[PDB]
Chain A
Amino acid sequence: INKPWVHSLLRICAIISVISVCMNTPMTFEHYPPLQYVTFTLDTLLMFLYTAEMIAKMHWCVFDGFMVFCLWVSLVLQVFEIADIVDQMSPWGMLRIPRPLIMIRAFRIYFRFELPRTRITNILKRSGEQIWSVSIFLLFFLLLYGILGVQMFGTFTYHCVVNDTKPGNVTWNSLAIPDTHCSPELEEGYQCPPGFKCMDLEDLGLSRQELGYSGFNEIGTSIFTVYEAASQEGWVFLMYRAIDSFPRWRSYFYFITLIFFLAWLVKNVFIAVIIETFAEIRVQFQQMACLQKMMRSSVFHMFILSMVTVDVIVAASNYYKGENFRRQYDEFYLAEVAFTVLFDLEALLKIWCLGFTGYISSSLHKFELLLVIGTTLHVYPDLYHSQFTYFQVLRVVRLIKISPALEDFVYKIFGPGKKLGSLVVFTASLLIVMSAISLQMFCFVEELDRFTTFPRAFMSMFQILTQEGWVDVMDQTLNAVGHMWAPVVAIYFILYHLFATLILLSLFVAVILDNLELDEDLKKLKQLKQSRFRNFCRVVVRARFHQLYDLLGLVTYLDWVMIIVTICSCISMMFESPFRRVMHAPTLQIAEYVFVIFMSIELNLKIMADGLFFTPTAVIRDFGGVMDIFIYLVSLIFLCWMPQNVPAESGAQLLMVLRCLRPLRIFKLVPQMRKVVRELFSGFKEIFLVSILLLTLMLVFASFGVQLFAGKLAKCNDPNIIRREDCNGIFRINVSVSKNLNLKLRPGEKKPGFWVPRVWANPRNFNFDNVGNAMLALFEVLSLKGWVEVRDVIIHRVGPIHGIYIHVFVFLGCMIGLTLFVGVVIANFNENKGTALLTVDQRRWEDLKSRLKIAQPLHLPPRPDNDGFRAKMYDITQHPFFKRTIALLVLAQSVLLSVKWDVEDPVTVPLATMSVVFTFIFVLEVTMKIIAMSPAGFWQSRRNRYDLLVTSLGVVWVVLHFALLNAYTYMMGACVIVFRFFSICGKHVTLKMLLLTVVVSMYKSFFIIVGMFLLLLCYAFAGVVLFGTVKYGENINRHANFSSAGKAITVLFRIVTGEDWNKIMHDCMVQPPFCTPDEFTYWATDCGNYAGALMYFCSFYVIIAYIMLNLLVAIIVENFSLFYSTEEDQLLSYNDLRHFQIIWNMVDDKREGVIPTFRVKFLLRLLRGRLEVDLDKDKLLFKHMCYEMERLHNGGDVTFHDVLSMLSYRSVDIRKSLQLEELLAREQLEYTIEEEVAKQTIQSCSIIHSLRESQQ
């Protein structure tokens, strides 16, 4: 195998082998008989060349041996299959499950990095340990919410059926339309009206496959449902079912907290882990004549770009007129031919001028000539409006050259092509391999059309990757295979979803961010480069007031009055409705009047105090003042007008909608919210350029869709009719009863439905007839919500080939396009905070400084000696075995909540009793420390405070339970178990660090959450006034409404997660003849607002999801690196600081926190482990550290933090971790110490001391 070509051919043949196994499918052979054999013709060839290649090497290779064995096995299986002795629909096909892995050989030689593989092994060690930590964190959260759901909810099997219904015969015609859950109580949940009765479907002989899988029956089902909801997929409907079945507050608290904690923060911890992985990569990689002159004219370039613009616009302007208007030689065809000739002449003249050699050398000209070739072929009648049109619609990319700022921003954000190129190649390869594996796994299962061919398997895997409806794919696949293999199939699907959503989508964000950052070289070099009556108003305006005194002096008295007045006006506006108007309800006008009058005064009191313009501190100086006076004028005009009749789509309604911007005064009256707005808008330029890139992508694909999908999505709503000629008359359509129940229909039963007209119409939610329709459809697809509907409609009504069109966009617009927003937001956040120009080492030094500042001495008392009692029990308490045993007991007690503690149920009585024992056990534990360390010492630790609290609650529960015994006692016991389970985060190191990260991120995110809530409140008022009375449609239902401010707030919060937000948008766009309009008022009409709804929903979704929601991500990515730490060779480890605290308590019997300067030598001599300062071999470091702790103060006893900072400085390369100022100061101080000790003459620490001295 000395030939070099053999390796290239073997890579090509590995690709061909994966291609062949992807095609070895039963249905593929059924639809194409000959393939059945060509596959056998490939393997037999490959299987030889591979076999002959291993023996030739014999006379990582274990992988090659196993794969050639797999090829042999597959070929023998296919031999027997062609013989008809083994059924093609048999599970034997699974014998080819490993074959796709041959694809690894195709991209194996490219694993040759520029560094020793030890660096890669260590990087992956670190990253995998952190991934395991965050996975344990996610498991903890999932188990917590699972037990919470099992205890707060039950089995959602109570549905309303028709009055007279008996068990066994429950059918489709028994449920309501749509199916509705209910409550057996009288004041809890939903009560369905007369004619219907609430009954348990599971009691009526109904299997659970028919009911579904998601629920809170037991711990496993609850954890499954909680993980499904954590992906923000179908959680709002689960919430609706819960609100119907059980009290509302339970569902609200539960699901909103689950979305806030699990779906956001805990899921951003993985993004933070991958970002730190890239940072560690960067770190470890740093530790080493007439026509020639005219052609170049600016006017000619401008002319060519103008012609490209005209071409794209003319091509996209060919909207659908009707079946009576279109030709293959239309006028648009002639215009496109003319533009093609023009640009071909343009390219050929460039070639004649600069010569093909110099012309083709440019990448831009490479792309230009590729477009020329593709468009000259596209103008061919047989290729017009086909898949070649892509080339044409790519001409717009040329326009990117008109703005050099956008060009440089593209070059920057996309960075070196290698990174994101390899990421894209890996994504494609992994998708192909997983699709092939799932294919060969389910290619034979009957009644499952999701993996019957490789295209469908790839579509399924892509759907799981996009998270839109992956639960449906999993449920279908599980129902397909027997209940015996359902668990393993579910585990496989869950593992794939986890790896695809928490690693790959995070890898994209990490790559984009890393490209948005400067490299360490340029960072270092750049940091090296830059080394009367007016007096009364004045007094009343400028007059103002621990931290309580700081909060009271946060703003002026007038600003405080304005804040309170604004909050009061907002609370009052929360009560306004389409039927309780502020114009007709005097009780609601009070606040109104106030807000006006007061505000007026304020304005005057400020105007007369600071003028309005051309002064240093004017009133209308910023955009904030302009917004303030705008709000004031709107409010005053509305108050003076108070129109009693507000027609829809009128000026009065616009005034009312503008009046909903009142909550934005809090952005200007509160300094922290002003800071939020400023820090967010400091990156508006990059946000705008990313928006322009996304708009260019959407324009390209919308032009393509309009030329290829115009008028071709319409169809007859009767599935039996095929031609538009027979789409007339009436037919019996089936109504959607339930999409969660799989109740099969009987042979002698008719599905519920009714007779309707036959119509040839498009989908109500999307179409490609105009450029605007296509642009809006693609904007909706960009959210990955309801895009599977568009995919299926395009694959069915247009053709399967066009399935490419929808899959490329979703990849370039979502996996890459929307990632850009995340990267830009996080980069602007880091820049504002001031850590963007610091190298990774400097960031880690800052994080270490913070961690050592927040650290305090380990205040645990010493081990007694006078008493064998306390000494023995102390030795027994602080033993790690005892600690881990108590941790296991805490983890096991929570398993008692696996079943709902119920008085109606007997299984509760044992469980509860068991828990009692647990409680008693815990008492003993606590009690023994109260004997080991004395109450004074036991109360020293803030964790033991929580332990004693929960143990006392548990004792109280035991008493009240074996004294009263009722439902309230069981609820109390469940709460006690939940608290003692939450206590487990204090037993585990990394779990504690991660929960610290999460809680501190929640704390530091307070003002961002408050600003998001203010924007949501403005939008909620605007929506209550716009769509307050909109006819119920697809998603506007009893749950999703704008009739109240609370209903609007909740539906907007749902929209933040994107859960079918476009459906709600299209519901609020309803206009006649689908609704009854009114000429007088807007609250007397069931119509919506088309443009109003578009603006409202699109702007809200953009602003919240694509921008502000990422602000939290950033914060996480920050506090993560601030709290999580791993053992390194350059800084202080958690082990190091714990050992330092231990030795500090050992050398300082006192607890004053200060140690005499002569006892510092004792501390150093006593310091062992990774910080030992050997006096036999390193006397100089010891003397220097002692003199430093003796000089810090003129003989004064030092502090714990003082010695800790000394050790921190002495344990890292100052030249690579500190900045100019601090580096110079520290080197000066250290050399002063050194030379002073010299004159007075007459491990991490040791290793860096060697570095320092040798370098000197």
Chain B
Amino acid sequence: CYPQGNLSDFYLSFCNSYTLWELFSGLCRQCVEAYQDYDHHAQEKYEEFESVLHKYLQSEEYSVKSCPEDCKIVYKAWLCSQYFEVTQFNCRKTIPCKQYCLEVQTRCPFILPDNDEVIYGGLSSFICTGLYETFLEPECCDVR
């Protein structure tokens, strides 16, 4: 409960779902400042996602079960998991971090990608599984 600005009491600024204990156990100036740099990069990417999502006027209609809140939550979770490929241990509720990917495409709207340098043919902007591949290992918190 000491967001940096026992190492298991110091969480990151943006990726609040991670602790210095988890980072050092998986992935002090040396690595701490690198972790905060990764945090800043993830913050920038998530701010870009939020910029693209606020311009989606169909935010309160694309789904009867999902809202922009859960979409943003799961997307930030997935982004932080991709930036910190580590395993959490103090989580009370566990979830296979890869699952977060699915959650995104389950709770976020269908954003149409542009067709200039490639024809997607109805493919969404956010997809998880490829042509015949076993999607699912690390374990993260369930912040849903």
Chain A interface residues toward B at CB < 8 A:
160, 162, 173, 175-178, 180, 192-193, 195-196, 320-322, 711, 714-715, 717, 719, 727, 729-730, 732-737, 739, 751-757, 759-766, 789-790, 792-793, 796, 1029, 1031-1034, 1037-1038, 1063, 1066, 1072-1076, 1078, 1083-1086
Contact = CB atoms under 8 A, between A and B. Distances in A.
A759 B52 contact: no
Interface stretch (B9-17, B28-36, B113-121): B113-121
B55 A1034 contact: no
Interface stretch (B19-27, B87-95, B123-131): B123-131
Given A177-B55, A735-B125, A754-B48, A1034 B113 contact: no
Contact of B123 (A178, A320, A764): A764
Interface residues of B, number: 49
Most buried by B among A322, A754, A1075: A754
A1176 to B, nearest CB: 81
B61 to A, nearest CB: 7
Contacts of B49: 754-755
A789 B130 CA distance: 20
Contacts of A175: 55
A1032 B121 contact: no
Interface of B: 45, 48-49, 51-58, 61-66, 79, 82, 101-102, 105-107, 109-133
Nearest to B62: A1032
A735 B112 contact: yes
A760 B127 CA distance: 10
26 contacts: A160-B57, A175-B55, A177-B56, A177-B111, A322-B132, A714-B131, A717-B113, A729-B82, A730-B82, A734-B113, A734-B114, A735-B125, A754-B45, A754-B48, A754-B51, A757-B128, A759-B127, A760-B130, A765-B121, A1034-B110, A1037-B58, A1073-B102, A1074-B105, A1076-B65, A1076-B66, A1086-B65
Given A160-B57, A193-B57, A759-B129, A1033 B119 contact: no
A653 B106 CA distance: 24
B101 to A, nearest CB: 6
A769 B123 CA distance: 17
B80 to A, nearest CB: 12
A761 B111 contact: no
Contacts of A177: 52, 55-56, 111
B96 to A, nearest CB: 13
B122 A765 contact: yes
Given A736-B113, A1034-B112, A1073-B105, A756 B122 contact: no
Given A180-B57, A1038-B58, A1072 B45 contact: no
Contacts, number: 157
Nearest to B56: A177
A806 to B, nearest CB: 14
A178 B112 contact: yes
Contacts of B64: 1029, 1083-1086
Given A735-B112, A761-B130, A1032-B63, A192 B120 contact: no
Given A322-B132, A755-B48, A1074-B106, A763 B65 contact: no
Nearest to A1033: B110
B140 to A, nearest CB: 16
Given A754-B125, A765-B122, A1073-B105, A735 B52 contact: yes
A195 B52 CA distance: 14
Contacts of A195: 54
A789 B119 contact: yes
A714 B105 contact: no
B51 A752 contact: yes
A717 B123 contact: yes
Given A736-B114, A761-B129, A1085-B65, A792 B119 contact: yes
Contacts of B118: 715, 717, 719
Given A753-B52, A1034-B112, A1063-B122, A761 B79 contact: no
A1085 B63 CA distance: 9
Contacts of A1033: 110
Contacts of B109: 1032
B125 to A, nearest CB: 5
B79 to A, nearest CB: 7
A756 B53 CA distance: 13
Contacts of B61: 1032, 1038
B10 to A, nearest CB: 27
B106 to A, nearest CB: 5
A1066 B124 CA distance: 12
Nearest to B42: A755
A759 B127 CA distance: 7
Given A735-B112, A754-B48, A759-B130, A1031 B121 contact: no
Contact of A761 (B48, B110, B119, B127): B127
Given A176-B57, A178-B112, A793-B119, A1076 B62 contact: no
B23 to A, nearest CB: 19
A777 to B, nearest CB: 10
Contacts of B114: 734-737, 751
Interface centre among A177, A1034, A1086 (most CB of B within 10 A): A177
Contacts of A796: 119
Given A764-B122, A1032-B58, A1038-B61, 14 more contacts: A729-B82, A752-B52, A753-B48, A754-B45, A756-B127, A757-B82, A759-B130, A764-B120, A764-B123, A1031-B62, A1034-B110, A1086-B64, A1086-B65, A1086-B66
Contacts of A1084: 64-65
Contacts of A180: 57
Contacts of B125: 733, 735, 754, 756
A1032 B61 CA distance: 8
A320 B61 CA distance: 38
A295 B34 CA distance: 83
Nearest to B132: A322
A405 B110 CA distance: 50
Given A176-B57, A754-B49, A1086-B65, A763 B119 contact: yes
